[PDB]
Amino acid sequence: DQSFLWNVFQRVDKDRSGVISDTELQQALSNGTWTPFNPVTVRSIISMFDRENKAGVNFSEFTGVWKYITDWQNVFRTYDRDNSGMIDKNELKQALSGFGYRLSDQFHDILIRKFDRQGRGQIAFDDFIQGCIVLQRLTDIFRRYDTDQDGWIQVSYEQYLSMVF
Amino acid sequence: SFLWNVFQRVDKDRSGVISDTELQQALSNGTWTPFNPVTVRSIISMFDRENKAGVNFSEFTGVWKYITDWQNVFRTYDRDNSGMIDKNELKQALSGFGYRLSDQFHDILIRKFDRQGRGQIAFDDFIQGCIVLQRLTDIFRRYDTDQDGWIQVSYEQYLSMVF
Ligand SMILES: [Ca+2]
Ligand SMILES: [Ca+2]
Ligand SMILES: [Ca+2]
Ligand SMILES: [Ca+2]
Ligand SMILES: [Ca+2]
Ligand SMILES: [Ca+2]
C-alpha cells in the first residue's frame, strides 16, 4: 500500500518529479554524520531495486528500496557497542564473523581504511551499505570462476583484464 | 589571448572559476540531453590543484586542451560520421589505445557506458568509458609480473585488490 508511504513522496518534489532520481531520495536519510548521503551508495539501491534500466523506483519495489536500509540498520544497531554509531576493528571482527567469515586480524585492519575518511579508525553508515554489499559479493564472483577450496583463481592477460571490472 | 574571452563566456557570475554543474552547460555531447555529470566530475577533479572542484583561467587553460584532444579522437574513429560511435568504430577506438579486447567484452563494455540504449556511445560516454577503462588496466598491469597476465590470488589476499 502506497498510502503507508504517501507522505514519503511529499518531501521528494523539488522539481515535481514523482520518479526518484539519485538525489530525489538523498534528503530522506541520514548517514550518521550530518553530511549528505553519497550518491554512489544510492544507485546501488535503485539499479538493484528497479527493473527499469534508468535508475528510478516505484511501488513494485520501493516497498523494499527503503526496506533494505531497514534491514541494514538493525544489524548496525545490534552491533554498535559504543552506540556511538560507528564500528571499530574489534567490533567488525564480530560483525564480519557474524556473517560466517573466517578472515584474520590483519585484514581486520585493511578493510576500515577505504571507508574511514575522518581517520579515527571507524566506519560511518554511508560507508556501510555500499561496500558492505560490494564485499558481500567478493566471496561470490571469487566463487563463480574457481572453488579451489583454498582461495585461488586466475586467467591470462587476455580478457582476464576484462574480469577485473 | 582569446581564451581570456572564452573563460568568462561560460563564467556566469564574474567569478573567475568555472563551476562543475555549470560546465555541464558548455560541453555538448550531442544527445541534445545533458553531458554526463560524472564525466563532468572526472574532467574537473582530474585537473584541480586543490579541493575547490573547479578550474579558474590559470587552471582551465589545459582542460580546454584535454577537451580539444578528446574530440580529436572521436573525429578520427567516427569515419561514418553520425555524431556518435558504434561497436565497429568503438573497436578501433579501444584497440588504438592499445587494448587487446575481444568482441564479447565490447557489447559488454558498451552496455556499461552507452547512456541511452541505442548501442551508440556518444561523445560524453566515451571519455567516461575511458577513465575507468584506463584506471583498472593500471594497477593490474603493475601487479601481474610476467605480462602473461595470470594472477594466483588467495581469499584474503585477493579481496584487497578491487578495493
Ligand atoms: Ca520524485
Ligand atoms: Ca560501536
Ligand atoms: Ca563561475
Ligand atoms: Ca570525417
Ligand atoms: Ca559514426
Ligand atoms: Ca604474474
Distance CA B132, CA B42 (A): 10
| Residue B156: how many other CB atoms lie within 10 Å | 16
- Contact present, A37 and A26 (Cβ < 8 Å): yes
Instruction: Say yes or no: B2 contacts chain A, CB-CB below 8 A.
Output: no
Name the closest ligand to CA A57.
1
Q: Flag if A104 and B156 touch (Cβ within 8 Å).
A: yes
Tally the C-alpha atoms within 13 A of residue B91's C-alpha that lie toward its C-beta.
9
**What does each C-alpha distance from B105 to A159, A164, B144 come to in angstroms?**
8, 12, 20
Distance CA B60, CA B54 (A): 8
**Residue B5 DSSP SS3:** helix
Residues of A in contact with B136 (CB under 8 A): 161, 164-165
Name the closest ligand to CA A77.
2
Resolution of the coordinates in A?
3.1
Distance CA A22, CA A43 (A): 6
Distance CA B144, CA A163 (A): 14
Distance CA A49, CA A46 (A): 5
Distance CA A66, CA A74 (A): 13
Q: How far is the CA of A152 from the centre of ligand 6 (A)?
A: 14
Residues of A in contact with B157 (CB under 8 A): 151
- Which cell numbers hold the place of A144? 563463480
Distance CA A72, CA A92 (A): 15
Residues of A in contact with B152 (CB under 8 A): 152-154
Beta-carbon contacts of A32 under 8 Å, excluding residues fewer than 6 positions away, are: A85, A86, A124, A125, A126
In terms of CA atoms, which chain A residue is nearest residue B117? Answer: A53
Domains along chain A? 1-165 (1.10.238.10)
Distance CA A103, CA A66 (A): 30
Beta-carbon contacts of A56 under 8 Å, excluding residues fewer than 6 positions away, are: A19, A20, A21, A24, A46, A50
Distance CA B152, CA B107 (A): 28
- Which cell numbers hold the place of A7? 507522505
The single-letter code of the amino acid at B138 is D
Please report the number of interchain residue pairs, chain A to chain B, with beta-carbon separation below 8 angstroms: 70
Torsional class of A35: left (φ above 0), alpha (ψ -120 to 50), beta (otherwise): beta
Q: Flag if A107 and B149 touch (Cβ within 8 Å).
A: no
**Residue B56 DSSP SS3:** strand
CA angle, B80 as apex, B77 and B83 as ends, to 5°? Answer: 75
Residues of A in contact with B101 (CB under 8 A): 159, 161-162
- Which approach determined this entry? X-ray
Give the DSSP letter string of B78-129. Answer: -TT-SSSB-HHHHHHHHHHTT----THHHHHHHHHH-SSSSS-B-HHHHHHH
Instruction: Say yes or no: B156 contacts chain A, CB-CB below 8 A.
Output: yes
The single-letter code of the amino acid at B133 is L
Q: How far is the CA of B33 from the centre of ligand 4 (A)?
A: 23
Q: Flag if A110 and B160 touch (Cβ within 8 Å).
A: yes
Instruction: Say yes or no: B151 contacts chain A, CB-CB below 8 A.
Output: yes
Q: How far is the CA of B75 from the centre of ligand 5 (A)?
A: 9
Instruction: Say yes or no: A6 contacts chain B, CB-CB below 8 A.
Output: no
Give the DSSP letter string of A79-129. Answer: T-SS-SS-B-HHHHHHHTGGGS----TTTTTTSGGGT--SSSS-B-STTTH
